[PDB]
Design brief:
The structure is a homodimer. By secondary structure, chain A is α/β, with parallel strands linked by helices. Chain A has helices at about 55-70, 100-110, 115-130, 150, 160, 175-185, 240-250, 255-265, 265-270, 275-285, 290-310, 325, 330-340, 350, 380-390; strands spanning about 5-10, 15-20, 25-35, 40-45, 75-85, 95, 135-140, 195-200, 205-210, 215-220, 315-320, 360, 370-375. The PDB classes it as transferase.
Chain lengths: ~400, ~400
């Protein structure tokens, strides 16, 4: 009974999942958080954080690998899937990892210095500890590679694009790809003749316009920073306003990049929390700045959902997904009420239902556009790619 | 037969118009270009650029004033209208200029250092040369002041808004106000129950969502830089991509602000021209980068028109205006074809017609949204404000 080992080897931590091939369901999931810092620990299923301190990426994965053998699961690992942050222009689909692939990941790595090098560390580790196991690289940008130049060009001098690689790449590709696939079945649509908007709201937040099965426009830019306002990310911001701030308070570009990543977004406007559940409660208890942050949040999503609709010949579906997307009854409704212009009528009985109801329609019949909630499963999509690439012979 | 003197006293030049009160039509128009530079000149009606060299704002207006008396027009100046770039939060409508008003303009002037101080120079001049003439200040932001906080807040720390004044202000207010007013009559709509999108495409480019006679969302930000890609302005740009560029090529924020204002936009992608007529011809003659620049240009407009529609309960009209908006048969159509999703069908016979046809419908009957061209008249709107404020007693 073979299994797929999924790895999101981020900068600060190493997340992992062990999916069964037969069911595509998680048998085991863990995390190696606080990496390289004096005390690094491994928390599998959340039962006991074993302090594997004084250790790096190579041994943290060797700690996870030993625990797989503790559960007699090592011998059953047929495939390993690696989540990669940035594919650049070089990667349009998931690939079997060879030396050539490692090189090409290393080539585009300047575009995501924090994430990509951390991903490569995890690739080497898994390659070392499991050499006779087929390994797959799944990229977080590759879905958005179907974008036409008018969709991905910035209004900068052409040289910044041709020699340096400055363009729109977009992120949450795997999520957007997964959810879109699921929507065709749920909504009973023809992939070859369809237009969807997918709102991935959660950790980061992004919108994708999926036309006839292809990503044609997406909210995020070169960095995960452009687009929607997020938990701690500012979203769309006037560069003139930024340059003004840098002059008025005398801050370096380095200062502001840290401000826009860590101090901004929902956290920034509310001055309270980056967490929705806290801000939803905060508003319910007469907090204006938490209410404002949500109202702004909802507005920018509503702006980008309608915006991205332009890249469709027809609008069949708006799909909510991700932590906030799947669970927030409020945000979903405020967003939809904001889009009455698109002819949306929302069934509030259906919108009430918690996430346990999984893939569900949430718009009433008179609606000209079908709204739905689809739980995102990046782990399942990574596995499916790996299983598919498993049958191939390289 | 009284007249209104309109002044756009920009940083580099001083434009002016002399409108008749009875007709609201231009009797005289000129420009004092290349200000303060060794050779400054005055070109009235474009007949003879008289080199009033070695001179500043106070004497350039004194050169225009003498030429008004040369045409026995000085004694007939009942009102003077000043175009102001940035009103800040302090100005929501046009006002009669008093000392208090001068102060308040001087207060918000840090927000537009290039433009506002140039505007104040022209106010002092006109005040000096015409002391017994009522003068009106018309602000380029004041129309957009009806925006709700969720529409104008950036996802930055709240402090940047409350103490420093960093928010969305928007521009082309006077144009957006004028055109919207004209649309109600042209489209035979009820102002109190209407939703319009106005695309001001020309010099700079901006979109405004006008709901029930009020500006509820607009493309430009704190600076005229945010929003649509423009002639030499980049438009919406990822801050992460900007910060990346500053690292990769080692450029100061000052460098990039100059790059994004002067070297970017249509000029940047094409590497040829910031002028549409040149780029339209260039594409017609197999130039890919000029074609790409236009395709990108059209796409971003299509993105923002659909985007701004979200802030409406209903979409009745899309209105094209400004240099590019009124004259470009191509751009208008490419934009509308991009918005087939909103249910637009375009009458190409009507879209063919040149600007001489003035205020015209350009969408066919089966269209769910009325498209129209309305020539913008900032001069006429400034005059109308002044005439109105002329009847008031301060
Ligand atoms: N019941 C829940 C669960 C999560 N959430 C929100 O979803 C977000 C988590 O998103 P991800 O899991 O995609 O990172 C958190 O910001 C949290 O506030 C919520 O608003 N209601
Ligand atoms: N017939 C015309 C006239 C002007 N234009 C464009 O309109 C723009 C001028 O806009 P403004 O007058 O608003 O500054 C120029 O970029 C020019 O290329 C055009 O494309 N066709």
């Amino acid at each position: 009974f073979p299994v797929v080992l999924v790895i999101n080897c981020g900068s600060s931590s190493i997340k992992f999942s062990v999916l069964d091939v037969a069911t595509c369901d998680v048998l085991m999931a863990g995390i190696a958080d606080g990496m390289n810092t004096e005390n690094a620990f491994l928390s599998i299923n959340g039962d006991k954080p074993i302090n594997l301190a004084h250790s790096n990426y190579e041994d943290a994965l060797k700690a996870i690998a030993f625990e797989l053998e503790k559960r007699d699961l090592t011998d059953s690992v047929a495939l390993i899937g690696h989540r990669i942050a940035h594919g650049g222009e070089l990667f349009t689909q998931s690939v079997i990892i060879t030396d050539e692939i490692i090189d090409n990941i290393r080539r585009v790595s300047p575009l995501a210095p924090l994430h990509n090098y951390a991903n490569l560390s995890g690739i080497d580790a898994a390659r070392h500890l499991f050499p006779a196991v087929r390994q797959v690289a799944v990229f977080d940008t590759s879905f958005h590679q179907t974008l036409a130049p008018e969709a991905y060009l910035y209004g900068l001098p052409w040289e910044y694009f041709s020699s340096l690689g400055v363009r729109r790449y977009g992120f949450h590709g795997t999520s957007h790809r997964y959810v879109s696939r699921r929507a065709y079945e749920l909504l009973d649509l023809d992939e070859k003749d369809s237009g969807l908007i997918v709102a991935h709201l959660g950790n980061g937040a992004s919108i994708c316009a999926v036309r006839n099965g292809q990503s044609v426009d997406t909210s995020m830019g070169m960095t995960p920073l452009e687009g929607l306002m997020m938990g701690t990310r500012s979203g769309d911001v006037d560069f003139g306003a930024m340059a003004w701030i840098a002059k008025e308070t005398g801050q370096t570009l380095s200062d502001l990049e840290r401000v826009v990543n860590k101090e901004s977004g929902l956290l920034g406007i509310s001055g309270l929390s980056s967490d929705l559940r806290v801000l939803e409660k905060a508003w319910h208890e007469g907090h204006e700045r938490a209410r404002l942050a949500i109202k702004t949040f909802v507005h920018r999503i509503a702006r980008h959902i309608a915006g991205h609709a332009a890249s469709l010949h027809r609008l069949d579906g708006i799909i909510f997904t991700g932590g906030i997307g799947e669970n927030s009854v409020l945000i979903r409704q405020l967003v939809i009420e904001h889009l009455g212009v698109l002819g949306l009528t929302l069934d509030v009985e259906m919108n009430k239902q918690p996430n346990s109801h999984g893939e569900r329609i949430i718009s009433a019949n008179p609606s000209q556009v079908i709204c739905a909630v689809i739980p995102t499963n990046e782990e399942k999509m990574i596995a499916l790619d790996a299983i598919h690439l498993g049958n191939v012979k390289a």
